Amino acid sequence: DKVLKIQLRSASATVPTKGSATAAGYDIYASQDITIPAMGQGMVSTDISFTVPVGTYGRIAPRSGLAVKNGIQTGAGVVDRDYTGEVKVVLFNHSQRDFAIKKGDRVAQLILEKIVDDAQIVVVDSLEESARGAGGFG
Amino acid sequence: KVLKIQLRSASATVPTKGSATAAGYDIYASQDITIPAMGQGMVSTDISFTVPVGTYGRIAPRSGLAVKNGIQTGAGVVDRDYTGEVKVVLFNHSQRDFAIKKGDRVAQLILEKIVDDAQIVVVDSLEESARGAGGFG
Amino acid sequence: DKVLKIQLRSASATVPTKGSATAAGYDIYASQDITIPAMGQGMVSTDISFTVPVGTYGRIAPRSGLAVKNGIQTGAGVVDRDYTGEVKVVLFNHSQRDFAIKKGDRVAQLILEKIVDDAQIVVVDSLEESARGAGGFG
Numbered sequence A, C: 001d002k003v004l005k006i007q008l009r010s011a012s013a014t015v016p017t018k019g020s021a022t023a024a025g026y027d028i029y030a031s032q033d034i035t036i037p038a039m040g041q042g043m044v045s046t047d048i049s050f051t052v053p054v055g056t057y058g059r060i061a062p063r064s065g066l067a068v069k070n071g072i073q074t075g076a077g078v079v080d081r082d083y084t085g086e087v088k089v090v091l092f093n094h095s096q097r098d099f100a101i102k103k104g105d106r107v108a109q110l111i112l113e114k115i116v117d118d119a120q121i122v123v124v125d126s127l128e129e130s131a132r133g134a135g136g137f138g
Numbered sequence B: 001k002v003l004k005i006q007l008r009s010a011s012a013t014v015p016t017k018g019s020a021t022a023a024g025y026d027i028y029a030s031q032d033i034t035i036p037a038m039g040q041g042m043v044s045t046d047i048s049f050t051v052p053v054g055t056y057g058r059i060a061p062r063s064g065l066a067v068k069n070g071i072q073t074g075a076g077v078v079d080r081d082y083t084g085e086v087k088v089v090l091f092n093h094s095q096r097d098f099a100i101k102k103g104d105r106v107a108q109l110i111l112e113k114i115v116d117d118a119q120i121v122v123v124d125s126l127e128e129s130a131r132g133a134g135g136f137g
């Protein structure tokens, strides 16, 4: 499907918004003030729950300006389709300054990543030979 | 819709889905290791796998370890043609060392669907959009 | 409709390239020298713009080798299909070693992540009950 169902748990929540015509993601808004400490982390409230479309999960991904200006990086970020709790935004602050967040600030984005969510695990003896082979971390 | 998993030793665990319609498969450490505070490390899995056509394997974070322990996955892109042992790269952004024991779930594998057969083509200019050059706002 | 269009904004830019026959990503090249300081961050110029295919966004993802050998993690990372500015690579350096970048170095990789870009947002009083429910961060 294409339907993203959103539950607003309080008057402090904001419906996520699409910031441009073919934006990858939807802006997620803080529903409560919080400070993320320098070289530290915290969890931003949203007061929202959602059910992403079948064939996706909801990825909480960085708002680009916050990364550059404030050293902010999203942590965790995988929202499962069966999750009905409040979605929380985990933020790492890699800068030397505490970062102030106010209720209604855009703190991250939600991307409806398409995935294979019905895969069959098959245990095998070996994998198909490739030119890459075992080469990694080059 | 087939994920082929190779178990390379007795210390490997087949990855597992943590709920009915979980996005990801939990990945298990095959070794004990410490991820130093404000540092990083690499966790063995003793597994290899081949992701389905049109996907790559993203090594994504477990949510509890991020909140409780400051753990974040690094690197994280497993190509479909990789046949080596898959490694979990971990950053510890906390002030506390993080101990991992053999058999702990240290990350999750997500089969991210991608366009892996694009034609890359050089153009003089892109389609004009409302967004334009607007970035990092 | 599987075409990735790349605009080279200068002689210093390099068209991104696949590093193996079925690599997930296209390596992104620095167009200008820069140093990412130990326990710090920076922005890498590419002098490229691109329009990703319909149904995707461009994710600027980390190169594996730089993560383990240099402590490098990409920040931000979400390039919208309608972006026509210069694409910039945000790098965090989590190591104690300044990371020296030279024009022509591979600095990140571009992954054409498939997403639902035409979802309909529907606000509901409650989500469908699941066995997971509000269970998160377990």
Ligand SMILES: O=c1ccn([C@H]2C[C@H](O)[C@H](COP(=O)(O)O)O2)c(=O)[nH]1
Binding pocket: A060, A075, A076, A077, A078, A079, A080, A081, A083, A086, A087, A088, A089, A090, B018, B062, B063, B064, C135, C136, C137, C138
């Ligand atoms: O960025 C975080 C990542 C996870 N979750 C919630 C939703 C997910 O389904 C997750 C699942 O928790 P465990 O399965 O790791 O317990 O917790 C948060 O709200 N957002």
Ligand SMILES: O=c1ccn([C@H]2C[C@H](O)[C@H](COP(=O)(O)O)O2)c(=O)[nH]1
Binding pocket: A135, A136, A137, A138, B059, B074, B075, B076, B077, B078, B079, B080, B082, B085, B086, B087, B088, B089, C019, C063, C064, C065
């Ligand atoms: O978190 C990491 C990311 C990379 N790899 C391995 C598998 C990938 O295919 C990769 C590619 O190495 P280079 O192409 O970056 O050398 O190395 C690890 O096992 N897991």
Ligand SMILES: O=c1ccn([C@H]2C[C@H](O)[C@H](COP(=O)(O)O)O2)c(=O)[nH]1
Binding pocket: A019, A063, A064, A065, B134, B135, B136, B137, C060, C075, C076, C077, C078, C079, C080, C081, C083, C086, C087, C088, C089, C090
């Ligand atoms: O790693 C970064 C992530 C974002 N952008 C650019 C392209 C995106 O479309 C973005 C959008 O800016 P805001 O919408 O966050 O203002 O800016 C960078 O070039 N690369």
Ligand code: NA
Binding pocket: A132, A135, C019, C020
């Ligand atoms: Na290779």
